[PDB]
Design a protein around this ligand. Structure first.
Ligand SMILES: C#Cc1cccc(Nc2ncnc3cc4c(cc23)OCCOCCOCCO4)c1
Length: 275
């Protein structure tokens, strides 16, 4: 009794877009997409067995439409399978936060938390479990506007971001995503620290069983840290809902310095305007 997935799968002529540079290495390039009969230029990222998987990704990305999730613009079916998406010029948020450590205020950190919760709440609406929420998989369109990406694991192994019940019984829920939301917030609040750094993943299951959790980040008031901790409750239903994380961080974002203590407080069209 599910709704029909009427998303459109756009097939792009490879002559419609111009690669311009490698961004990473699986390979992602920067380029420009010029819809043939349209006077627009669109900044884009361009990304058996392997083909099957990347098309699962294309499936998920084409089926989401929300200001805080990356949506597939199209695929190109040439010698290889290329996913074409909105270019996120500032890269992923894990790198971004490490590079600008000394220039990120409480307002930005809390706003990122709100926007990521909105993206995740949207995916919950769409009955989608991301299964790989993490700061590396959140992209930065502008410092003011981040979006969740990498749906290569989503469904309707990153041990250090995973709910305990996922490490134990490979169970995954919107509430196991909340757990990953909490590890991702911890990544941001520590300006990109590696969680459980030095602790091999084999030990993670046991550490979490003894009751250990990531420590309280220096800039974090107990209010913010307490929210993180709640995402790490053993009882998955005792963890916050995304719609609540949105609300709580919204409140905090209205007075950020009360919640984070930080020393120093032509013819181009962005994809978001190409509908
Ligand atoms: C289709 C598709 C698809 C599916 C999953 C992930 C991505 N990934 C991306 N989507 C949009 N824009 C990006 C911009 C990047 C980038 C990756 C991007 O590479 C991060 C490495 O750091 C370089 C920093 O350079 C600045 C810009 O880099 C694309």
């Amino acid at each position: 009794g599910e709704a029909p997935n009427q998303a459109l799968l756009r097939i792009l002529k490879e002559t419609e877009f111009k690669k311009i540079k490698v961004l990473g290495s699986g390979t992602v390039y920067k380029g420009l997409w010029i819809p043939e009969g349209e006077k627009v230029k669109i900044p884009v990222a361009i990304k058996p067995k392997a083909n099957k998987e990347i098309l699962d990704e294309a499936y998920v990305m084409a089926s989401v439409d929300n200001p805080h999730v990356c949506r597939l613009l199209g695929i190109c079916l040439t010698s290889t399978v290329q996913l074409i998406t909105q270019l996120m010029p500032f890269g992923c948020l894990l790198d971004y936060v490490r590079e600008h450590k000394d220039n990120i205020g409480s307002q930005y950190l809390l706003n990122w938390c709100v926007q990521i919760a909105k993206g995740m709440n949207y995916l919950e609406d769409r009955r989608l479990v991301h299964r790989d929420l993490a700061a590396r998989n959140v992209l930065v369109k502008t410092p003011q506007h981040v979006k969740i990406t990498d749906f290569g694991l989503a469904k309707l192994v990153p041990i250090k971001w995973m709910a305990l019940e996922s490490i134990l019984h490979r169970i995954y829920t919107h509430q196991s995503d909340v757990w990953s939301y909490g590890v991702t917030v911890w990544e941001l609040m520590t300006f990109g620290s590696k969680p459980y750094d030095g602790i091999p993943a084999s030990e993670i299951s046991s550490i979490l069983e003894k009751g250990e959790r990531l420590p309280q980040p220096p800039i974090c008031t107990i209010d913010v840290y307490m929210i993180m901790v709640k995402c790490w409750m053993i009882d998955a239903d005792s963890r916050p809902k995304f719609r609540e994380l949105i609300i709580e961080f919204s409140k905090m974002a209205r007075d950020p310095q009360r919640y984070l203590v930080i020393q120093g407080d032509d013819d181009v069209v962005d994809a978001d305007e190409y509908l």
